[PDB]
């Protein structure tokens, strides 16, 4: 009776693979080559030749285990608090275990979705007082070594300027040999409202959404382009490929909320329960994510 996380719509089925771990790290190794100098012309006798160098890079993904505690009514004490149509103490905000666990799990899944989208953990509207996390723990928005474009405050309404920034970012993208892949765009409701205006005298049957889809298809080898609206974002536009070879999600198999075996019973009617969940596991290649920020200040 718990709704599926909304983060599933941001990934392809092949882009997600579970890992059996609660807290710790995983690591992978990649091998690269480079040219140290111009080639050597083979003429007459020569012993000193230009060299080709090699390199190894080890990428680590960290995982973190977190817990929450909630109060509820004791199973034996339920019958003294139920009623004809309302269950639980309305005055004291006490609920049965099932309802309390359902609501708490929903809240935790919302928190997990926010972390996966933005790479931060906070409960303030300002976004401050963030929980300090481990290195190598990033989301789709705070991933380093990506393409970042910023539209100025004065052009917060100019869709032409927004599209110019998006086009510059798309040009700076480096999909490379993995270009023949579907693409995913995530926008805020204000941007979605802006995208339906006619393209600019105004055109006929040509809208900014169609123009953006054509521009992205120009680089994705005319593959599918998907657009999603997320109220979690605000003045942000996110563009990235749905290719496992570039972006992958290896979450813990215990990432989603799970009840604990410990229950804090007492002489009274109030009991306490615990829920565990795991955070971390986003792997991304560099210069494959475009993030556009619309400033207001």
């Amino acid at each position: 009776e718990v709704k599926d996380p909304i983060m599933y719509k941001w990934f392809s089925p092949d882009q997600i693979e579970d890992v059996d771990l609660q807290m710790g790290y995983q690591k992978t190794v990649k091998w690269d080559a480079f040219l140290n100098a111009n080639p050597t012309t083979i003429a007459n006798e020569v012993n000193t030749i230009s060299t080709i160098g090699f390199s190894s890079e080890v990428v680590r993904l960290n995982y973190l285990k977190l817990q929450y505690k909630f109060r509820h009514l004791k199973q034996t004490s339920e019958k003294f608090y139920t009623s004809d149509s309302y269950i639980g103490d309305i005055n004291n905000n006490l609920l049965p275990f099932a309802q309390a666990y359902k609501l708490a799990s929903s809240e935790i899944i919302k928190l997990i979705n926010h972390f996966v989208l933005t790479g931060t953990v906070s409960i303030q509207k300002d976004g401050k007082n963030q929980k300090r996390l481990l290195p190598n723990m990033y989301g789709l928005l705070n991933m380093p070594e990506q393409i970042k474009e910023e539209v100025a405050s004065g052009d917060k309404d100019k869709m032409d300027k927004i599209f110019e920034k998006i086009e510059a970012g798309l040009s700076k993208l480096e999909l490379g040999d993995e270009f023949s892949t579907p693409m995913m765009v995530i926008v805020d409701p204000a941007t979605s409202l802006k995208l339906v205006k006619p393209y600019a005298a105004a055109s006929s049957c040509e809208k900014w959404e169609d123009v953006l889809i054509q521009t992205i298809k120009a680089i994705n080898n005319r593959e599918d382009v998907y657009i999603e609206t997320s109220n979690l974002l605000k003045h942000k536009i996110l563009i990235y490929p749905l290719n496992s070879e570039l972006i992958k999600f290896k979450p813990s198999k215990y990432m989603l909320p799970t009840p604990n075996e410990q229950v804090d019973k007492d002489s009274t009617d109030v009991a306490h329960s615990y829920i565990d969940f795991v955070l971390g596991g986003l792997l991304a290649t560099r210069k494959t994510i475009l993030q556009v920020n619309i400033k207001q200040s």
Binding site: Y8, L256, T258
Partner: peptide, 29 residues
């Protein structure tokens, strides 16, 4: 029927995985 709490947790994780697979099967963009 889960004999112990470890089996219960494994069943919960398998249920989450199956729900994810079913959601992707039923997804149509």
């Amino acid at each position: 029927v889960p004999i112990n709490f470890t089996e219960f947790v494994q069943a919960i994780s398998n249920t989450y995985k199956q729900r994810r697979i079913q959601f992707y099967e039923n997804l149509k963009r």
